[model samples]
Target: SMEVNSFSGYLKLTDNVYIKNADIVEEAKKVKPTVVVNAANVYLKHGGGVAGALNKATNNAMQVESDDYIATNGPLKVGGSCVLSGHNLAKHCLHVVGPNVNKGEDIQLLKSAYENFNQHEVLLAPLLSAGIFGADPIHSLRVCVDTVRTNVYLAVFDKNLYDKLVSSFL
Candidate 1:
């Protein structure tokens, strides 16, 4: 009395697409989304957009220990550039290219926070329902962290990168 759909999860090579890193950053700006900073090391710092109850906990912990901590998907600042550098590697991360925005409550940010940083279990059906613009979970997870970072930049910061991508897109 149960039904399963396999093709639902399958993504063809043609259906999936590849976007260069530079273009990804550009698209993020166009969408007027938040900035995506990909750094091996990130911590809660003043003026780094750390706030709310989450920030309170992190900051309180840091004050007590004074250790290096990594902050995720918070407010990545502009003019601060760095490469992906850190100590070790963990599991994989998925890259989901967001769909076009018509001001529908910024689901991209919510999903980004969930899939990229949230520590929880997600059911497949609801996850698949969220897939738009051919989000390939397998390939996206298989992709390099740098590639995932690039894709995130495109989705979040592409709006602000308009002038930069003019020559390239044209």
Candidate 2:
């Protein structure tokens, strides 16, 4: 038998209307000004992680070229280049070429997040540099309230952060 390199579960985004971003109760307070979460525009995006290596060889030809080294190379390793495919996924997924180590990415994300709030569309965006940008989650959460856009969603890979954001806003 050959030694296996690695493996991960495929993410199946079942809904287009997923909760894009989330925050902690404390952070939630800073934006929504309330503890009540409104689930009206809330939906879930299932598949959101590095590409797994189990059967990707047969999934797509691109799999042969996809890099699965997120840990060693850092999340930015896949940044904007890596693409994972799954069934029942969301309609649109915004790939971010981030992990902005020095630049003020949180600020940009703030802008984008706020932009989504005021638009009447649900979006699925990756939390670029989220693992690296420690405090950025606060900004992501703050962007999710009373958006000028009614149907907008911001998603990050971090579970706790996502929860805080959606629960607070919904």
Candidate 3:
């Protein structure tokens, strides 16, 4: 853990990757990316946790539009994902379903959620499956880093997660 209490900056992992301990929404608002990954449930609900925050970040447009998508395509299974228009941030928002440990989902299912990404684009990401989905934060971070060859800017809000991730990287 960092000796300092609050953190508001990022660490360079490589020329292509960075990790930050800050409000993701606030940072993204200040400087947007091509896409921001929303760690969504299979049902595409955005009532709580990171999903809720992202919905709030987008002025509820994400949830409203997501509901419309679900209405047509139905609920996504583990590893299913879709992209939606970015109402107020980024160019698009990628809504991806991760494994929920409560459902006996595996860590590989968590990695599958990120399978839609390409290596070349600039992306803002969360540690998918690390929240209510119940995956280990450090493990999830490793999966993100392992799976995406992306030019990623990972934004972590929780201090504990931030410190752990930074320490793991360092």
The candidate 1 region of ten consecutive residues with least summed lDDT is 85-94
lDDT for each candidate structure: 0.25, 0.32, 0.75
In Å, residue 84's CA in model 3 sits off its true spot by: 0.1
Q: For every model shown, what is its TM-score relative to the native structure?
A: 0.20, 0.35, 0.87
Candidate 3 lDDT for residue 7: 23
User: What is the descending TM-score order?
Assistant: 3, 2, 1
- Give the Å error, residue 134, model 2: 4.3
The Cα error of candidate 1 at residue 71, in Å, is 11
- Supply candidate 3's per-residue lDDT for 111: 69
Stretches of candidate 1 exceeding 4 Å from the true structure: 1-18, 21-24, 34-37, 44-170
Q: Judged by lDDT, which candidate is best? A: 3
Which candidate do you rate higher for TM-score, 1 or 3? 3
lDDT of 2 by residue, 1-170 (tens): 12121212213222322343333122222222111111110111112232221123125322332233343343422123322332113212222343343444434443443343333233333333334443355554444443224433333546766666556434
Could you give candidate 3's per-residue lDDT for residues 1-170 as a string of tens digits? 11111223668876666888877677666656667778888888997677888789777888889999999999988887887875666677788888888678876887678766653266677878777888888787777777877677788899886887788567
Best by TM-score: 3
